[PDB]
Amino acid sequence: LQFKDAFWCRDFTAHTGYEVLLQRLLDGRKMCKDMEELLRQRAQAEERYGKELVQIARKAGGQTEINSLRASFDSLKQQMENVGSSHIQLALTLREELRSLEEFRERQKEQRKKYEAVMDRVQKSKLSLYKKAMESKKTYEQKCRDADDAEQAFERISANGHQKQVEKSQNKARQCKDSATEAERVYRQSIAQLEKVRAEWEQEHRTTCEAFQLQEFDRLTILRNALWVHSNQLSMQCVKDDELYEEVRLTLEACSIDADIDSFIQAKSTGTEPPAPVPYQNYYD
Amino acid sequence: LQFKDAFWCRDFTAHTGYEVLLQRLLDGRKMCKDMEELLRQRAQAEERYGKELVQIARKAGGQTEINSLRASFDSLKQQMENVGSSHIQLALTLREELRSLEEFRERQKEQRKKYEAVMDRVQKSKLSLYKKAMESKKTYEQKCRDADDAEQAFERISANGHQKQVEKSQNKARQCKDSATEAERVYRQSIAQLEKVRAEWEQEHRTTCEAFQLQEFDRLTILRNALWVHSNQLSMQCVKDDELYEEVRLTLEACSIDADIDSFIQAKSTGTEPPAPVPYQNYYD
């Protein structure tokens, strides 16, 4: 199905098809803004979260610990900062995707406005010339009835009437037929002018429908792609973080409880022999 | 080598080995607090981050969109709330791990204080009896020098001195030797009392060292496992989030651009034929 084949109106004076299509583009524009707002707020959350993780890592303690357990705790603080910075970078990625959608939306608005100007102009002219044609049609039909009455009035009083009275109706019927001829010419001219604009309107409408369908195809394409890219970027963030936390686990594999205890003893041992007992010392021996 | 075999002092009055071991337990207690503070702050970040994701999802728009693209956007909002709620649950998980370490830390302090009480009592008694023994040694040696002087005074005048003077110095020298003998028995007893406490101190020291080593083994074990659990819980969060974002991609695979355009046309189509042209209508037909 195409837009150009499904949004016509049997009513000559109705442009509901164009109104419905234009309303769809406005609804699509709102959808693009909502997708933009979600990216903006998500980016703000990621930056706030990422900065907080970095602050926790930089301010965390562990300075009284030594050896392999210290190296494992230091690894966690280091990888926390790496995750936090990676989320700050993710916020920049989301804001670039947001900027791309923002550019696409205004580009579509610019082109949409041009078609709106053409359609508004030709639709107003079409309804104006239709109004004039129906006014000319009414006048033409009244002038015909006026001419028929004048002719019937002439034939009536021309059977036993005075030449002066007949001459009055003779001229009145002639003037009425002249007015009917002129009203027909104006009516025919009104029909010709309306037909010229109707042909232009039909082509512009069909042209606009093809353009509006291309905009909708492009918008649905870029919005579906944006959701796919967004979901992948979030999934890629989970993979990056998992790899960074794995670095902590790898350090933990090198953490041996016995080695740390042996390391403390070797570094801080004060002596291996208890003090000798205090004996009695004879002052003369 | 063990704590009980490596933290002795050859100096009888020094307990640096016990002081060094006690300092290590205090440093280890600070390390447990630092691990507690990191978990506490990480939980706060996860709760704040999780709550923000839920609010973004609940307030996000998309109400003007229809059909499969709407279902994809609604899927993203739904999975955002599921991720946000999952992070709030993660914060509760972290606070339970934090509570477990807090309980372990205070249990160790309670037991540590008990060993400190035993060591403080026997070390002070050991230093007290040593001080008294050295005082008895000083008194005993002074009484001996007094006896030597009294004996030297007797030997001086016993060659050409008056019998009365010689007898007088003989009695003074004998009385001084008696005082030195009495002071010797006091000195010998001081040594015996100190030796009983020295043996008691040595056994208590060895007992405390074995206990302090068991505490260090327990602390290093629970802190190593806490880091392992923490890293695993964060990695499990990456997998949970990745599974939730995968649900969005599954919805996107069912998103067809042609189907959405066809669905809009079928629902909003206004007509398939353009309006007929307005002809000139002869009043006499």
Residue numbers in the entry:
A (entry chain B), B (entry chain A): 5 to 289
What text appears in the publication on this structure?
To better understand the molecular basis of the physiological function of PSTPIP1 in the immune system, and its role in autoinflammatory diseases, we elucidated the 3D structure of the F-BAR domain (residues 1–289) using X-ray crystallography. Initially, we solved the structure of the G258A mutant, and subsequently that of the wild type protein. The two structures were almost identical. After superimposition, the root mean square deviation (rmsd) between all the equivalent Cα atoms was 0.275 Ǻ, which was similar to the estimated errors of the coordinates of the structures (0.23–0.24 Ǻ). Since the G258A structure was refined to a higher resolution, hereafter, we refer to it. The asymmetric unit of the crystal contains two molecules of PSTPIP1 that form the characteristic elongated crescent-shape of F-BAR dimers. Each protomer consists of five α-helices, with the longer helices, α2, α3, and α4, forming a helical bundle. The dimerization interface is mainly formed by α2, α4, and the shorter helix, α5. Mutations D266N, E277D and D279H, affect acidic residues that are exposed to the solvent on the convex surface but do not make contacts with LYP, and those mutations do not interfere with the interaction. The same is valid for mutations T68M, V122I, G258A and T274M.
PSTPIP1 is an adaptor protein expressed in most immune cell lineages. It presents two structural domains in its sequence, an N-terminal Fer/CIP4 homology-Bin/Amphiphysin/Rvs (F-BAR) domain and a C-terminal SH3 domain, connected by a linker region. The F-BAR domain of PSTPIP1 binds to the PEST subfamily of protein tyrosine phosphatases (PTPs): PTPN12, also known as PTP-PEST, PTPN18, and the lymphoid phosphatase (LYP), encoded by the gene PTPN22. Positively charged residues on the concave surface of F-BAR domains interact with the polar heads of the phospholipids in the cellular membrane.
